[PDB]
Design a protein around this nucleic acid. Structure first.
Ligand SMILES: [Mg+2]
Ligand SMILES: [Zn+2]
Ligand SMILES: [Zn+2]
Length: 395
DNA sequence: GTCGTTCGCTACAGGCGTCGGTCTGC
DNA sequence: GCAGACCGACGACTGTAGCGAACGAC
């Protein structure tokens, strides 16, 4: 069976999130969006575990289900060097053991969903491999809290320890990450690290796996690529639409080149801020080889359908008209990815014509894109001739 | 025209380093 | 005067009350 999954969210116990990020709301949004599996997130917080046990019924000992949506134990933790790390747990006993093992190295583990662990990346990876916990550098290209912002390679970060995956993130895709030779030996993950159950947030990126049943062991075998199970697709947001794609400032959000950044010593002239290095320039810095493996699954660049509808209707992202159109589209069809890539444009025209034309322009890459960086999302704009034309003469 | 209905922009929140400025002891 | 210690503020880690203001069936 083929299943879509996003394995990186945060509960309402974390910071800078929404109070609507609870199990029922997340399950409803995932079921209405077209998502089969969802990572629990913040599994080290005991209150979140209590809410999971209350608002759900278990499948086995490491996979749960609520409102027809499966859930596996995941969590993001912070490093002593301030490096985000994503962890996947086999069962709940592993969660309890890992929690009780790091209480002496933390102070907010029992309070916040995203705990601060006073441990080294090598130490965290070793403790994870000790309990068969899957570990990866989550959004490892962010110039704020990532792996490549502090360390220069995976070996320098983990040392003798090993990992199991590597989250690409918003501003990255499979190819630019595969521009590193060592990355050829590690599977990729395209998650969201989303904080809101909004359509353009929850499940903006996901991974499509081929499995037999829906449990932790099947996901583990699909990640390791054994027993017929495998990760067959990585649906991700276009790298240009990320928050930190290009090297830009953190205050006025002005894009600068790497050469000008080094010349100005990372000091914004007409703003007085600290310009942060984008993921593209960081990857070009750590460029290793121009080759990439064949077994690498494809990465279909998709844009959030909510933002497409918002830019077509000429209204905001959280307005009522765009919500109505998005809900009618999800009712008439399947999921977001279906309308974004798979569904033909003549079928999309049955619900709305302008949205169909915009999706055609996105598939044909004629959609104008201005990249983002420093904390500002990338922006999309459709030309006027694509709007004032029909569908027949379009192609 | 009318008065509920909805938009879009601004402010602010809640809990570990980095970056300047300032004090101290020499 | 100055190296080094001490201090405060600032923001990721985004989401959303909320509030004039434009809107849209009567
Ligand atoms: Mg991406
Ligand atoms: Zn994170
Ligand atoms: Zn600036």
């Amino acid at each position: 069976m083929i299943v879509d999954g996003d394995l990186h969210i945060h509960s309402h116990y974390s910071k800078a999130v929404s109070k609507l990020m609870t199990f029922p709301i997340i399950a409803e949004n995932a079921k209405l969006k077209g998502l089969n599996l969802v990572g629990t997130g913040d599994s080290l917080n005991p209150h979140w575990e209590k809410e999971l046990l209350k608002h759900s019924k278990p499948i086995d000992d490491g996979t749960f289900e609520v409102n027809g949506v499966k859930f596996i134990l995941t969590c993001e933790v912070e490093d002593k060097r301030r490096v985000h790390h994503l962890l996947i747990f086999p069962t709940l006993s592993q969660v309890r053991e890992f929690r009780e093992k790091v209480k002496i190295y933390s102070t907010n583990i029992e309070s916040e969903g995203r705990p601060n662990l006073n441990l080294t990346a090598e130490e965290i990876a070793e403790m994870a491999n000790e309990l068969d916990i899957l570990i990866g550098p989550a959004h490892a290209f962010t110039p704020w809290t990532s792996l490549y912002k502090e360390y220069d390679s995976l070996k320098d970060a983990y040392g003798d320890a090993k990992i199991d995956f590597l989250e690409l993130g918003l501003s990255a895709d499979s190819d630019m990450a595969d521009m590193i030779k060592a990355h050829h030996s590690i599977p990729y993950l395209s998650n969201s690290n989303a904080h809101s159950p909004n359509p353009h947030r929850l499940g903006r990126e996901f991974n499509r796996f081929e499995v037999k049943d829906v449990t932790f062991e099947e996901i583990r075998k699909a990640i390791k690529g054994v027993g017929g199970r495998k990760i067959m697709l990585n649906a991700g947001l276009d790298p240009r639409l990320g928050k930190y794609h290009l090297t830009a400032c953190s205050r006025c959000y002005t894009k600068y080149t790497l050469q000008d950044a080094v010349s100005l010593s990372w000091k914004c002239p007409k703003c007085g801020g600290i310009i942060k290095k984008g993921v593209r320039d960081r990857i070009l810095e750590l460029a290793d080889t121009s080759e990439k493996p064949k077994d690498r699954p494809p990465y279909v660049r998709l844009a959030p359908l909510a933002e497409i509808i918002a830019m077509v209707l000429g209204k905001g992202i959280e307005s009522k008209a765009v919500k109505l159109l998005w809900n009618r589209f999800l009712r008439e069809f399947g999921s977001e990815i279906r309308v974004l890539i798979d569904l033909p444009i003549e079928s999309i025209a049955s619900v709305h014509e302008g949205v169909a034309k915009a999706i055609w322009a996105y598939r044909n890459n004629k959609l104008i894109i201005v990249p983002g960086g420093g904390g500002k999302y990338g922006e999309i704009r459709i030309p006027e001739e694509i709007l004032k034309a029909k569908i027949e003469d379009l192609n």
